[PDB]
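Work Package 3 committed the consortium to producing structural models of liganded targets before the mid-term review. Because experimental data for this complex are still outstanding, the team generated a predictive model from sequence and the ligand definition alone, so that downstream docking and mutagenesis planning could proceed in parallel. The input record is reproduced below exactly as it was submitted to the modelling pipeline, together with the SMILES string for NE6.
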Amino acid sequence: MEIKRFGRIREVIPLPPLTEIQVESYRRALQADVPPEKRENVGIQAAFRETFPIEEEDKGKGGLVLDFLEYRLGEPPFPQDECREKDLTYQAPLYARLQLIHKDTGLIKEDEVFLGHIPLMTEDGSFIINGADRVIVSQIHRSPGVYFTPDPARPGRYIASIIPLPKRGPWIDLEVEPNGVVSMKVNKRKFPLVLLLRVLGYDQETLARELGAYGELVQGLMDESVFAMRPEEALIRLFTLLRPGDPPKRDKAVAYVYGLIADPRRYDLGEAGRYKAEEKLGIRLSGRTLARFEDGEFKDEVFLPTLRYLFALTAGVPGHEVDDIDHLGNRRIRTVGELMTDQFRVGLARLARGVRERMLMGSEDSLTPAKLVNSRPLEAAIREFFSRSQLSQFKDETNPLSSLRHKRRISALGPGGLTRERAGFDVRDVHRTHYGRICPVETPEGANIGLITSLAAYARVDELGFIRTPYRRVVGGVVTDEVVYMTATEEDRYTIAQANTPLEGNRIAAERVVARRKGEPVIVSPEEVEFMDVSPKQVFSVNTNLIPFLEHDDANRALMGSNMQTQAVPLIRAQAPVVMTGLEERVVRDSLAALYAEEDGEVAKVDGNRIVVRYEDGRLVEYPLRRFYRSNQGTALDQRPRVVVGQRVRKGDLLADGPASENGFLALGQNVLVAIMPFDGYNFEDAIVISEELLKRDFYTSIHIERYEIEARDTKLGPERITRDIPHLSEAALRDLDEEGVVRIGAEVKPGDILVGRTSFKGESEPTPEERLLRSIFGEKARDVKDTSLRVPPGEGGIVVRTVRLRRGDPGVELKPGVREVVRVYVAQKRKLQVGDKLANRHGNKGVVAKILPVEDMPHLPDGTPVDVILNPLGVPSRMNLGQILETHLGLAGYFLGQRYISPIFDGAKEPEIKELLAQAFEVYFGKRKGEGFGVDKREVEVLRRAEKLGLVTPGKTPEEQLKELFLQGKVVLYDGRTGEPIEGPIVVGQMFIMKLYHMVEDKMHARSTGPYSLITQQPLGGKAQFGGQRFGEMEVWALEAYGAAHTLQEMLTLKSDDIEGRNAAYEAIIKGEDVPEPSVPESFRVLVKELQALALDVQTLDEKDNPVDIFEGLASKR
Amino acid sequence: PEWMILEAVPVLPPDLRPMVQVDGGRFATSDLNDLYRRLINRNNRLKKLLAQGAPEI
Amino acid sequence: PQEKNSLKDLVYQAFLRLGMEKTARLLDALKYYGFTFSTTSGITIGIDDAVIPEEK
Amino acid sequence: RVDYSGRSVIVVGPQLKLHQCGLPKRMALELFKPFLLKKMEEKGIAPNVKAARRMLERQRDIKDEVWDALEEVIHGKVVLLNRAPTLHRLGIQAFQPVLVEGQSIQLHPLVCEAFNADFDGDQMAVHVPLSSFAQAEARIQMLSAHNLLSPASGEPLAKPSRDIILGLYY
Amino acid sequence: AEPGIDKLFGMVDSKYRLTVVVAKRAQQLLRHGFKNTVLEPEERPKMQTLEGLFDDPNAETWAMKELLTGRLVFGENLVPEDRLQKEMERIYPGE
Amino acid sequence: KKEVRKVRIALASPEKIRSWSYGEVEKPETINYRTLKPERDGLFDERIFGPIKDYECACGKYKRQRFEGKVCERCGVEVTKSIVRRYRMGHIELATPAAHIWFVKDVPSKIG
Amino acid sequence: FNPLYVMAQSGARGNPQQIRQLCGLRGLMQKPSGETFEVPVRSSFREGLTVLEYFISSHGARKGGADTALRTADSGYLTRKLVDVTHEIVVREADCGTTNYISVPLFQPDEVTRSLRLRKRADIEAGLYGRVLAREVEVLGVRLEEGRYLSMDDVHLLIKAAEAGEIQEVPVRSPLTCQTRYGVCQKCYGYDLSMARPVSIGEAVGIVAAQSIGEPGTQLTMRTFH
Amino acid sequence: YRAQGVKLHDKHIEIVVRQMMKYVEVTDPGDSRLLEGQVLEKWDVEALNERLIAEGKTPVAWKPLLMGVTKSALSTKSWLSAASFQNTTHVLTEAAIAGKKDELIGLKENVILGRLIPAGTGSDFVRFTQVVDQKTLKAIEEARKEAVEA
Ligand SMILES: CCC/C(C)=C/C=C(\C)C(=O)[C@H]1C(=O)C=C([C@H](C)CCC/C=N/C(=O)OC)OC1=O
Ligand SMILES: [Mg+2]
Ligand SMILES: [Zn+2]
Ligand SMILES: [Zn+2]
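The resulting structure, written out as tokens with the ligand in place, is given here.
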């Protein structure tokens, strides 16, 4: 068909690289590829220039030089795809040119040390951790600078504070019950700030007198002038402020440290809070943070501005510099690069600790290179990091958007100093500054709400870890294509008109305009304007944008949509919406789902397994096509060629459609005939009915890939093995698993079959004497070997598809200790649609398949065409999620109009326009009718009569005509496939793009009866092929109690759970078809008693006669 | 009252603070044993010392 | 017209006036018809139904 | 954790009658295995126990009559459905199940009230009242069809909710 | 549903009382085959399996029915702890 | 065979304590590693807590349930369900008296 | 017969607020601080919102999905207490004999400074339904045996009776005045409420009450709002 | 609740209320101290030993007490429940010294124990109800004339 785009906002510039964040943050943190170790250390190399120069020089031993020179790395031991296979971690060792000298000018330079290797970032932006696709979430924090927070407790004034960001850096705060106390709080210990004022080299005079001027209230300062006359005195004294007790020898112990050492600096050389402080405190500072060199003493252009500012603040109107924390202009975002580097430092610093412990017993010169070395500490750090990092989580590649959007998220969780689970209500809040930076709407539904968010599509973060948003410069009515990314603060400085502002060429088209001044909803004649929003899109997260008519549904339900799209699964019969916002196309590119042409040429070869092409110049590049492959979440991930031989094609041209890409457009589902209306309560509550037809069309049919594993352990009781030869009884149970241990690929397996055959030795390989006899009676070969083969877990299986075997694989296998070899089998299954699956439209409208109807009874139109799905209308009012409605309305036209549409967000379609298209369509739908010698269905009349009584149609009009009128209201006439009789009332029908949602194995259909039992608690435990029990809790106890079902609750917790002997006796009883024994004491309790006793506490069960009672019936009574 | 003091320290049944083998040559337990251990250690050491008419210090 | 309450009240009485079990029958009865009708009721939702009064 | 428990997603059963509830045979099966087993044995089809036992270990080798018996057992018996959070006793109710296809639980529309839960994904927990005695309390003071009024207000809890009303109202 | 349920209540002082009752009848009514009942074949819990009607085995069903027919008696304290089983094990050997 | 109706909670007579202990732990030794053996007089000395194999002594001189509950004249371990191992309690004899904290840090510090 | 109308009305689904938004004015949305905005959200959902419009709204959207989380996640918190507090209480006796009781009003004083005012049925009903009459009651030419349970109608009647300025208080056996040992006698409780009849002995009332209270909790405005 | 359109019968609440009044404080000993704030009913034996029961004529003056649910229950006669809640140690410790006996009047306790519930079917009142057929009402006769040996 033909695509018809809408709205007319001139997006001056297309969207930015997406994963871009992850990619560059990292790119700008390594300096590998093109970086010649020339002019920069910004990240890791800075991580270097700090862990260096590490010295241990006593001018006596003289020179003990050990500095950095050049960092290096570059041989990924193995290839990505290969790393995944053997549960490896794609990365590359890291060498380093260093230098150790000697007082004797002994400059021996062992320019090598590759002990540690570090992970690498995929072409898409993710990581491979132990074969697992892992992802790193960029989290936010309170940018390092100076702030003045209104003192909470006392509603009289407020507290100021400072924040450099090292793992062991300063954290200043000020306050005062001033009479004298210049309350200067440090770690947990405060005192008068004055004392410090002189250590600076300034007394009450140079300070309090010249400054305490406008700050006439500087009495909260000047109290000890004598302490303020010879820097040196106050100087020493202050140490007091520290424990335990040391002599005034270290004239500058903790000083030089809080001067030009990593501590004081927020960022390197000011960048962090300099702009902050400085721009909010007059001018620049002393070098980078607080430093003073070639003078000895220490000059502080720090507290200098600070204090006086708290004054300029604890004053009248000298700047009124309050501090809205949530203000984005005051919150930084740590990104992978940065985020990782710090972790790089810890284990790094953890190595220097190591290296310094070496100068001790280090020979004269039997120490030079790496005899002073050890990666493990640092190795662990980072390793430990990724692998076990809170922000390190399995790549969510449910589909692409899923995987992509996942990258775009922002955490507020993590650093035990930068993150806290103390629900910060107002922090979870959507602060004004979020506009065009954070998806106001996109956020995980659940207690993690407002803590995890997505990035506003257009929003971008600069190396300073700050976001910025697109804005075009305005000139008294004239609109410039000159864009301007900008931050939160800078933003408040201006007046921003909404993008959608009427225009002409560039001249604005309005006497009054819609804008916001630093979040100020205002109207203004043009001249007054300064900047305009580039495009609505810039506000919301990406997937959020994928929603059509967003401007029509309530944000809340909207939230649902976004989330859901991420949970959308790749159908075989992929389909992009009959209507799109506009991103779909751009997405696939960035997601890296499909393949495009990096130049023009002819289609060389294109077999299903691969494609090759010749370039203009004449280059033959065969493109290995990743075939059917598992998703982290097991979904299928495959690309499909759409181009053919001899076919010429230019750059940017697609070649193979990713998993969920159609024509190169996102196809998170399928478009279909939905008819909104109640159907015998089968769509009762969110419940959704389905035209059996769809299945026949294998529409909603997916392919899940499931992987299983097994281990060869060299047991102490003797190693176990993978053999087709097992103590098993039958043979028909070996039909397929005949391949000398393994099951032959491509086999229809069902819960209970043997993917793999394994055997070991039980009961410490001691055959029961009981069993003994039995066994002998039929050939007593007590094979000490127990069959412990791998079976298909219950529920369901599918058919084999692939098998991988690792035998301490000399090629690179690193089998876990105790493991001889391992095995992996992958089973696929075309999970098709069935009663239960859940579906959702981009409009938060979600629900489950309640019933599948026979196309017959299925509601159809006069032209005997049945819709495919029936949607109850109730789920809308209480949802105010109209959007979908329109989507269907238009979904209906293009249906006949054999086309698709692109309606922009807060733009695109408009009732008229739609109301229009229908009319056209009405021709197709209706028009033909007569050209077939066909008039109006008698029943059609029936309805219409009724139709106008509802003021739907304008009375007296031609029956035929009336229809149109109706049609335009998106409603049509429907016949009941069952009764045939029409439906008393028009029915709005039409197309809707729907998605099938992912099925969590946790959401699987469980059902236990009896099985494993926690070795301790002695309570139902679930195995691999055995289910677990339901967590029966107090809430349920309470409920039960309320009713009064004594027994149940008892047996419930006893027999059914903790009472040992019971259950068995129970089982048996049932078996023999007998009644049930009574409940004894639950281990839980017995156990309890013991615990008590163990705590030296007699617990005594007694009767009426107050006579003790043994709950252990014997095994407690001794002697 | 005397009861509140101790000289007879109880001990949980084994299977309630078990010791089990787990992975390729390793096992697991409850801290108790440990706690328990150290304790015993101390007491028995003590015995000797007294048995050693040692400096009451 | 029948609705929530009307019904509710009706129910309560039912439950009272006549035993509880027969009442159940009723419910289902209701259930049944309530459903059957709604389906045929020809009651959809078109953006047009978002009838915007002029007094706006 | 309970022994004869199970969980699955719920669906609405317009066919169901107040005191009934749809139950995936497959799932049902496990929950009653023993009882079932017995019946089997009790019928030629199954010589002894371990027989039936293994006889069912694999779905492929799961015969027909199997179900025909399973039902038999069930006759009269009821079970319990839970949809957490269980806030008020009616957060649990009993029903005589009816065997159903598909791996999903068919819940009766009226109870969705107390079981404040819709079919936008809600799953439910099932439990089997073992002893004759348990079954009793159950089938008596816990049958969905026996709690129509609200213990708090005393008002008809189980009553026309959405679709139904509308129809009627119409 | 559940027949006579209401009426069933109308035959006890306490809701729960009834339960207990039934239950016990079941038990015993089980422990002794079924010859124990207080009703003829004409009226008997049935089932339609294998094309036909064959006695229903769900004790409650039975218990419940009997009660309806005043052909049975409960009470707080009716008789001696063992005479029942006793006399009862004679009349209907069950086993 | 009957039922209860009252639960008690009283301190523990060192006597009572000793009235429970199916023996006294004297040795720290957990389990022998070479064979994973409940160290003698140690924390798992099943001589104290019982068979690890229901109805069966250590040295194995006794096995079948046909030795109801006859102690081993050798390994000195009884014969019964190993299950009792999660129920029987042993003790330690304190060279010196030690205070039970729950009567100190709990205020009023009962004793004080 | 318009759908919506039909719906909301029948109560089948949707209330006014919901509609007002859809059909006409979404109205005022308020700030995070909590202070309502000065400019309103003119657009109806049908009309479609402004980027600006849309945005501004959301704040409450958060607090909305926010607020809820706290109870939806869990609020049993309440019940829990109650439970711990009322579990033991059970229907134990038949008659505890308490000569005393309580008298339920039908009027409220200080709505205006002490003027009198009849209570809303609901309230009243909530207070006397299935209650057991303390003393006999002569009214509207009809007397009420003292010890008589309060059917639904009965109440109405009374209700009707007080309208004829014929009464104000009501002698009724209550738990407060029940004399049972950590439980309650069949009389000081009354109807069952799951069934409209006199509660049978051995009923788990303590627990019941606790739940009846807890459950609702999850749907009460958490933080003070105005 | 009403203000939130929640229809709830008074009872339920009233119930929870009685419990806050459940305990009371003392002013006139007889044989106990003053801090003692106890479960109100103990008075028909204790406070009825007035000039009649024990006839000792030793009065017992006390004070009405109002405490929060937390409190009230937490101070239960049954030590278990009391321990089942926060500050388990204290509870115990006390009950230990007092060597408290916990009856099983309440549920939680009886439950957590492993015993059949005190109410519902667990309510003694009915628990025992007996039932046998009329066919057995002829059975009594056996042991009823199992004495008429000619
Ligand atoms: C002094 C501490 C006592 C204590 C709580 C012991 C718990 C032990 C031994 C367990 O393991 C238990 C446990 O975890 C949980 C339970 C059930 C599921 C919940 C019972 C709660 C009932 N609640 C009410 O009926 O409320 C009015 O029971 C246990 O014995
Ligand atoms: Mg739900
Ligand atoms: Zn031995
Ligand atoms: Zn009473």
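Reviewers should note the following from the model. The longest strand of chain A covers residues 819-829. These observations will guide the Year 2 experiments.
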